[PDB]
């Protein structure tokens, strides 16, 4: 079955991969190589299938894993792309409609004051056209009168030129127009960089931490500082000994938040924020690399910035003392906003930390103490 | 026909005013009073009648015109009305439709990326089917293989193999996912303060007044400087004699206009607001008083604002020299706006004068000389 040399090709030739005869395993190509029998042969497949078959079987789970990871974030990234496209909207949302519902309110205000003139000159046309009505109506008459029988003609003048005297002597008695300007569009727009501040927020405080120099009432509302007494402190887990401080109940150091307070001139201090990765205790100059920064004030206009660094910094002092700060926070760019906002229409921003070290912060302030009661400015919500 | 003394009346009793006759003339309520004759008191009528016409039809003159004048600040305060909604209504569209235009361009190149991740990880998923689907096809062999003739069965197996083990090996390698962020806010700002610019303004030149040291091409909107000579040459009204300088024939000193401009790295110069109806002869001795005043930079990074008083006003130092300047022009209270855009897409503000001096200005500015030609710097528009 060779059909060269008539045996059927019953040996393995491993060396050459050949299937061989008796001359072609002799000589010719194979004069010196080896061989194997076909038992063998078939014996050696059985043995050799299991690995290939777990090779092929090892790789196709290998190709399912690629295309199922595939698949799955793709859905991933399709579902970033759905969330912040209604993200999106979401904020478009609040500035659009918050800016066309207040212009929809001014529209109506305006509205409304130009009804009110409207109907009072209405009233004034009546009044006088009610005088025009009797003047014409005493004028008919005083032509009846000048051209009546002749007695009583020459007889009656003496009423109307009385009644004219005091018409006359009844003197008819003898203003409001705020109209728009150029400068309205820009104002405007300031406002509305003041207007970015979102809605309010879930407000309740958390006096557990009050050291007892400051004071805080009305069902934790209302916070103020004065000089009652001087006792000395008293500690808990996270309280403090010479760091007087309060802090919120609200903790949620991730995600965004906001709201406003006010504050004004207060004679000197330094506050700042703070983490719980430097030291909590006395006035020390405390390095703001272990999350406290430091900013130190006084005259209402003088203010000195604890660096992240060495020493302090200098302000360029503002065209007007402070009257508000509004706060907003938010971690995934370090976004942290405390900015003046003098009336609440207005906004100029003041500084942000452009470097981004996280420092997961804790939610308490103090002011510096009160040296006989010149430190008592209070803080409420709303 | 007196009734009581049985006389026609025909006395009027001027002394009590009273119409009364013969009997009542002489005696009764009148026995030593004032007589009239009647027949001279009906020519009275007569004769008095006209001036108190006059008298009354100004009284009705009075009525009418100020009825004339109440419904014509009427007219007024209703044309207002209509005219300052309807400019509401072209601010609302102005900003919010080109904001909104931005928004949906954003929207189309997410809808774009969208589809180009699913067609590339489409095509690399139609390749991994088509390679599993062979590597079923190529498995499905198993049958015959396992239950056919011994011979071809024993040898059949090697370039099969090394094809599998090629379309195994070859796995070709890959995230590229800008989805938004917190950092929204300033990025957001930055662009949304680009996005307050107004439409663009009519730009041209005249080199009518170009002292002839430096050169202006490029359909007169290229200006530089070059040192070919020196000479004064003929003067006119807004010409120079040493300051070099040009202006530009546009003079539209009305409404709101907006402009974008470049200015790049230049040794030392000046820049305030000058008109022409005050000098443009010499060293421009300019007066404050008059709308010209006068500010001054030098090292490229230092400005001092020289008011009309003995202490100019100082301005921070800047952290960067200039790259661009946009400038916007308004009537209503001497509304001058001039921000730094070093690109277009940000911009820092600068300061302006919350004063209201209309002051007609003239169009034209202009740096120190050469000075060995670090000041030969050209300039366009955008
Ligand atoms: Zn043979
Ligand atoms: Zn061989
Ligand atoms: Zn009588
Ligand atoms: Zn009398």
Redesign the interface.
Same mark, same amino acid.
């Given at each position: 079955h060779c059909e060269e040399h008539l045996d059927?090709? &019953?040996i @393995?030739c491993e060396q050459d991969?050949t *299937?061989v005869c008796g001359v072609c395993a002799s000589l010719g190509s194979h004069r010196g190589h080896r061989l194997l029998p076909?038992a063998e042969?078939?014996a050696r497949?059985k043995t050799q299938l299991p690995q290939?078959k777990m090779? *092929?079987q090892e790789?196709?789970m290998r190709?399912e894993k $690629? !295309?199922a990871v595939?698949?799955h974030? =793709?859905v991933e990234?399709?579902e $970033?792309?759905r969330q #912040?496209?209604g993200? !999106?909207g979401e904020? *478009?949302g609040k500035m659009?409609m918050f800016?066309?519902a207040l212009?929809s309110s =001014? /529209?109506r205000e305006?509205?409304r004051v130009?009804g009110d003139?409207?109907v009072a000159?209405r009233r004034?046309?009546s009044s006088?056209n009610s @005088? +025009?009505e009797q +003047?014409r109506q005493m004028?008919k008459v005083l032509e009846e009168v000048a051209d009546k029988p002749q $007695?009583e003609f020459?007889?009656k003048?003496?009423l109307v030129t009385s009644r004219?005297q005091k018409i =006359?002597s009844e003197s008819?008695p003898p203003i409001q *127009?705020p !109209?728009?300007? /150029? /400068?309205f569009?820009?104002q405007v727009?300031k406002k509305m #960089?003041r207007a +970015?501040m979102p809605a309010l927020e879930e407000l309740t405080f958390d006096p557990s931490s009050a050291h007892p120099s400051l004071v805080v009432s009305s069902s934790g509302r209302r916070v103020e500082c004065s000089d009652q007494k001087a006792p000395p402190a008293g500690e808990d887990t996270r309280q403090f000994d010479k760091a007087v401080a309060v802090v919120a109940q609200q903790l949620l150091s991730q995600g965004?938040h906001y709201w406003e307070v006010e504050v004004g001139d207060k004679p000197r201090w330094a506050l700042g924020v703070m983490a719980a990765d430097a030291s909590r205790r006395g006035r020390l100059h405390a390095v703001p690399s272990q999350g406290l920064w430091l900013l130190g004030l006084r005259d209402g206009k003088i203010l000195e910035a604890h660096v992240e660094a060495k020493e302090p910094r200098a302000l360029?002092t503002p065209e007007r003392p402070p009257a508000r700060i509004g706060l907003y926070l &938010? #971690?995934? /760019?370090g976004?942290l906003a405390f900015y003046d906002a003098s009336n609440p229409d207005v906004l100029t921003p003041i500084f942000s930390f452009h470097e981004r070290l996280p420092g997961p912060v804790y939610p308490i302030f103090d002011v510096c103490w009160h040296d006989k009661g010149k430190n008592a400015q209070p803080l409420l919500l709303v």
């Amino acid at each position: 079955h060779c059909e060269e040399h008539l045996d059927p090709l &019953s040996i @393995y030739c491993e060396q050459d991969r050949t *299937l061989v005869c008796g001359v072609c395993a002799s000589l010719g190509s194979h004069r010196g190589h080896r061989l194997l029998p076909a038992a063998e042969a078939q014996a050696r497949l059985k043995t050799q299938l299991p690995q290939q078959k777990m090779q *092929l079987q090892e790789a196709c789970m290998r190709k399912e894993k $690629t !295309v199922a990871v595939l698949e799955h974030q =793709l859905v991933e990234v399709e579902e $970033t792309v759905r969330q #912040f496209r209604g993200a !999106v909207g979401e904020q *478009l949302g609040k500035m659009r409609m918050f800016l066309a519902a207040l212009e929809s309110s =001014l /529209d109506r205000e305006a509205e409304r004051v130009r009804g009110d003139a409207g109907v009072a000159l209405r009233r004034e046309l009546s009044s006088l056209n009610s @005088y +025009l009505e009797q +003047l014409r109506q005493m004028e008919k008459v005083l032509e009846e009168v000048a051209d009546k029988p002749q $007695t009583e003609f020459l007889m009656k003048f003496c009423l109307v030129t009385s009644r004219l005297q005091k018409i =006359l002597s009844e003197s008819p008695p003898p203003i409001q *127009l705020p !109209v728009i300007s /150029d /400068d309205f569009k820009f104002q405007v727009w300031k406002k509305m #960089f003041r207007a +970015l501040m979102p809605a309010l927020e879930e407000l309740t405080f958390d006096p557990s931490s009050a050291h007892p120099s400051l004071v805080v009432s009305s069902s934790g509302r209302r916070v103020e500082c004065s000089d009652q007494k001087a006792p000395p402190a008293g500690e808990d887990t996270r309280q403090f000994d010479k760091a007087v401080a309060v802090v919120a109940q609200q903790l949620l150091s991730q995600g965004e938040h906001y709201w406003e307070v006010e504050v004004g001139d207060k004679p000197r201090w330094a506050l700042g924020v703070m983490a719980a990765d430097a030291s909590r205790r006395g006035r020390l100059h405390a390095v703001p690399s272990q999350g406290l920064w430091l900013l130190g004030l006084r005259d209402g206009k003088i203010l000195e910035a604890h660096v992240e660094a060495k020493e302090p910094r200098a302000l360029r002092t503002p065209e007007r003392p402070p009257a508000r700060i509004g706060l907003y926070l &938010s #971690f995934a /760019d370090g976004v942290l906003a405390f900015y003046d906002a003098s009336n609440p229409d207005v906004l100029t921003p003041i500084f942000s930390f452009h470097e981004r070290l996280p420092g997961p912060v804790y939610p308490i302030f103090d002011v510096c103490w009160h040296d006989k009661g010149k430190n008592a400015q209070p803080l409420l919500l709303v």
